[PDB]
Amino acid sequence: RVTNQLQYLHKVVMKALWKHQFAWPFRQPVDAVKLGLPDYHKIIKQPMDMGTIKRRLENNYYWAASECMQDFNTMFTNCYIYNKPTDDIVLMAQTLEKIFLQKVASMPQEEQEL
Amino acid sequence: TNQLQYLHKVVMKALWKHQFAWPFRQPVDAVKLGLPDYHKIIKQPMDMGTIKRRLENNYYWAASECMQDFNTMFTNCYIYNKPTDDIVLMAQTLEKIFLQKVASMPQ
Ligand SMILES: CCNC(=O)C[C@@H]1N=C(c2ccc(Cl)cc2)c2cc(OC)ccc2-n2c(C)nnc21
Numbered sequence: 001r002v003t004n005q006l007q008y009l010h011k012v013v014m015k016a017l018w019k020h021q022f023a024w025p026f027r028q029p030v031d032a033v034k035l036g037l038p039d040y041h042k043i044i045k046q047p048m049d050m051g052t053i054k055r056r057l058e059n060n061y062y063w064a065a066s067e068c069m070q071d072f073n074t075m076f077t078n079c080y081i082y083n084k085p086t087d088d089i090v091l092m093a094q095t096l097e098k099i100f101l102q103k104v105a106s107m108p109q110e111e112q113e114l
Numbered sequence: 115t116n117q118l119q120y121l122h123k124v125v126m127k128a129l130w131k132h133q134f135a136w137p138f139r140q141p142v143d144a145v146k147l148g149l150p151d152y153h154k155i156i157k158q159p160m161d162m163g164t165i166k167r168r169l170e171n172n173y174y175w176a177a178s179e180c181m182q183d184f185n186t187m188f189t190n191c192y193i194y195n196k197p198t199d200d201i202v203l204m205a206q207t208l209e210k211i212f213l214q215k216v217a218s219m220p221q
């Protein structure tokens with residue numbers, strides 16, 4: 001489905017996060033081979049990334065904005081769970097997630113199909 | 115604002131009474147829990163009691179600020195705890211409700 005909220009998530013939230021200077025670790029799935037992380041998929045059971053979310057938004061995969069919001073959350077949470085407290089990527093996720101929250105606070109209030 | 119009233123009366127109320135909410139209703143007490151490293155690792159402690167008090171005292175200027183506090187609370191939990199800890203699942207569950215409810219926040 002296309003809805004007002006999903007349109008906003010795509011054209012405002014994803015637009016802003018994708019081009020952010022801290023977006024680059026999150027633009028594609030975590031590549032455990034490239035990164036040398038033999039435990040990544042043992043710890044993180046539902047990988048998510050902004051490449052997947054953006055493709056889902058482009059292909060009308062979502063029925064409601066809440067589903068898309070959960071994917072963003074999962075991506076950020078995975079990052080916090082997997083990494084150490086002092087890792088830079090935590091600070092990068094935090095910066096992106098605050099923008100995510102700021103924009104979500106101003107999303108159209110009642111979901112309706114376009 | 116109307117949004118803050120919603121975060122207080124709808125969002126917070128739904129989260130607060132949840133069966134997984136008990137760890138999050140008051141600040142982490144690092145002495146009582148025996149966590150001498152808690153405040154070394156977590157630089158901005160946050161909890162729903164603090165947020166609730168802030169909502170009740172007109173501390174917030176925008177809904178977004180309140181939402182950031184909720185996020186800080188959840189994030190602190192994921193950062194401090196082990197991936198396999200039950201509290202991580204509890205936080206994840208509450209965080210999903212938060213986002214679900216926030217999605218219907220009035221404009
Ligand atoms: C022990 C080393 N740890 C890692 O590599 C974890 C990895 N850590 C990073 C990462 C990101 C930034 C820095 Cl400065 C260092 C590491 C990472 C880098 C990527 O490059 C394209 C993609 C996903 C990543 N990511 C995400 C997202 N979640 N965990 C990680």
Ligand SMILES: CCNC(=O)C[C@@H]1N=C(c2ccc(Cl)cc2)c2cc(OC)ccc2-n2c(C)nnc21
Nearest residue numbers: 136137138141142143147149190191194195200201
């Ligand atoms: C090694 C022990 N670790 C801890 O005690 C961390 C602590 N862990 C818990 C906790 C919560 C639930 C369970 Cl099942 C086990 C531990 C905790 C329990 C509380 O009881 C009133 C309050 C805050 C908590 N919390 C929050 C919030 N973030 N980290 C923790």
